[PDB]
Amino acid sequence: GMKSKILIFGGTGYIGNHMVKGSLKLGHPTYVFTRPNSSKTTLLDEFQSLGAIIVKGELDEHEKLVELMKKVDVVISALAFPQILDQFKILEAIKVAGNIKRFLPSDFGVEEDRINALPPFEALIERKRMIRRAIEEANIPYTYVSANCFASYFINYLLRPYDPKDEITVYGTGEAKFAMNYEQDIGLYTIKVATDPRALNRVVIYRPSTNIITQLELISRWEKKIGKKFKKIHVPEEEIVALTKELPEPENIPIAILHCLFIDGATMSYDFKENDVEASTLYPELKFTTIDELLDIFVHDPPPPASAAF
Amino acid sequence: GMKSKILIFGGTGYIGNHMVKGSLKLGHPTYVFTRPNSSKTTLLDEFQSLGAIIVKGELDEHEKLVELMKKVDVVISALAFPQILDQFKILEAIKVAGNIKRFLPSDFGVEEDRINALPPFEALIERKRMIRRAIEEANIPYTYVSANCFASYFINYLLRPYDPKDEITVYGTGEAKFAMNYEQDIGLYTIKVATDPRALNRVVIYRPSTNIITQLELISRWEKKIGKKFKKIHVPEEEIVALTKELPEPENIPIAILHCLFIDGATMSYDFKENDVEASTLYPELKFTTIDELLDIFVHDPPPPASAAF
Ligand SMILES: NC(=O)c1ccc[n+]([C@@H]2O[C@H](COP(=O)([O-])OP(=O)(O)OC[C@H]3O[C@@H](n4cnc5c(N)ncnc54)[C@H](OP(=O)(O)O)[C@@H]3O)[C@@H](O)[C@H]2O)c1
Ligand SMILES: NC(=O)c1ccc[n+]([C@@H]2O[C@H](COP(=O)([O-])OP(=O)(O)OC[C@H]3O[C@@H](n4cnc5c(N)ncnc54)[C@H](OP(=O)(O)O)[C@@H]3O)[C@@H](O)[C@H]2O)c1
Ligand SMILES: CCOC(=O)[C@H]1C[C@@H]1c1ccc(O)c(OC)c1
Ligand SMILES: CCOC(=O)[C@H]1C[C@@H]1c1ccc(O)c(OC)c1
Fold it and tell me: Which fold is adopted by the domain A147-182+206-270+284-310?
């Protein structure tokens, strides 16, 4: 009926698929832009069976983008690192169409406007800042989402649950705090805020109080859940820093991010601002899956590990 | 006609596809075993148009493998690291069929029976040795191929030609020698030796004299070819060794391999044995693409970078 029509770029992506599913679950007409040569053929059929409208095309097709923009109300971009500046093609179409009511660029991680990182990562978040500055300059309605750490992604990365090893790697001292959220929830909440007036032209941060922890605490809780003890092996901070300067790209990017998230504790190193919105306080009918619930999921039906594109 | 029938496992693989193409180019009836869910659909269509017989199935289908073995003469395995011991399923079928004239296990790299490496890599090559010991124990005719470094793979890895950066990473001092060969040639020569009596039950090493070089020399020759100078940044050996002990799996595997190849110089640290066969000396009608010809290829029509599975 009155439901906003949503267009999602990168909908077949790691986090994008959860936004598409969340959009459909909420009853929103959902358009998914995808490359003609995408290998996500089985996922696209799933989206279709769920009610999504699949649109094949390339970001270089300016006219196609403009005509598509005219048919929707909300635009969400879940594109990857290599395509950050390609979002200017999406922005140009939005500017020409002129009817878009909300645009969410591809952030979904740290809050780039209040934190800094080592060169490898700083370069990438500076590109994300460029997109933001352009949105504001053009007076385009927006919502900036800081989703913090993707939980399944990082529980897999830090605990390597699919590995029967007796040792576990800890980055730095392991005392740095960080927040992580279940992908399925990040996707649903993102759709919710994209139409919520309370998130119009604001930064929304996903930081439920039940999802804040340190590497050492996560390991301890996992050990209790599975009844096994691990030998902790630490990677000194000075070691991590040196690597970001010597190793080639993209190899040095994940290293810089590990420093940012697990040594500098960038997802928890700041206090909320007056205009900030913490998403968990928004909907009494919903809640983020907690860390304990996440660990239970990895015991009963663990999701496969993943690796972002650099 | 009287051409040996060849069955290739992992034929859709990075190096496997070159063996499939080489087999067909040489006029050999070629069978390609592939998983039903493989995403190499377009590549399979190419093989099919070239004359290959596509066989879909899983390695766990023992009966299917046995019946398949009965229809061929030569078996080549180009499976990946994660599937090294899965080759025992292939070997069991070969043993039951009893008609195979030559089996080449998935080596195609360093000569594991004469070199040792750091733990992350030593563990993998020990699995390859296990396959070898089993073949010999069973008196199965074989050929062990040490193809040394895949050239396109490593020119991409070391020079990062698709990167406009002004610096280049060097592992260790950069003075360690190594040999690298063009994938297309590795594929063709592999088919040739698989039926060549001169390679029966012998180790064949691919080491053409025109393809031996050091990291520093490769950089210097590339600089001359493209007319640009790079700043060399070295990663100390002690640094590389430390990482293999602290980083988790599979991250520490590539690092251990880099140490073995470019610091220890494992592809060039030994002299030939009495029974060794160096492939470039075998066919006066053929020759391996040289390093200079390889650099020219990267200037005129460079192949995309690749990353092995761990
Ligand atoms: N907070 C965290 O822990 C965390 C973790 C990972 C990622 N991230 C962030 O989440 C966002 C999305 O990351 P992701 O891992 O979900 O992305 P992804 O799955 O790597 O990629 C998203 C989609 O981009 C499309 N695409 C790929 N290459 C393209 C190209 N060359 N041109 C045009 N489209 C292309 C693909 O869709 P089609 O095949 O349909 O075209 C793909 O499914 C990023 O901003 C990233 O930084 C954050
Ligand atoms: N010397 C060097 O520089 C160098 C470089 C790279 C690799 N290597 C060596 O070359 C050999 C092959 O490596 P590669 O990179 O070419 O392999 P690859 O392309 O990663 O894999 C080969 C094939 O394995 C099949 N496969 C994948 N997962 C499987 C599974 N779970 N079960 C059964 N089959 C599966 C796939 O075929 P389908 O999809 O058709 O089933 C795949 O195309 C290895 O021995 C490796 O160590 C050496
Ligand atoms: C360390 C392995 O993960 C990564 O390198 C990148 C994908 C992870 C990531 C990317 C972008 C981010 O903002 C972020 O903050 C939570 C996390
Ligand atoms: C450093 C990046 O490459 C690798 O980690 C592995 C795929 C390379 C490889 C794998 C197996 C080998 O025997 C070998 O010898 C030349 C090389």
Answer: UDP-galactose 4-epimerase; domain 1 (3.90.25)
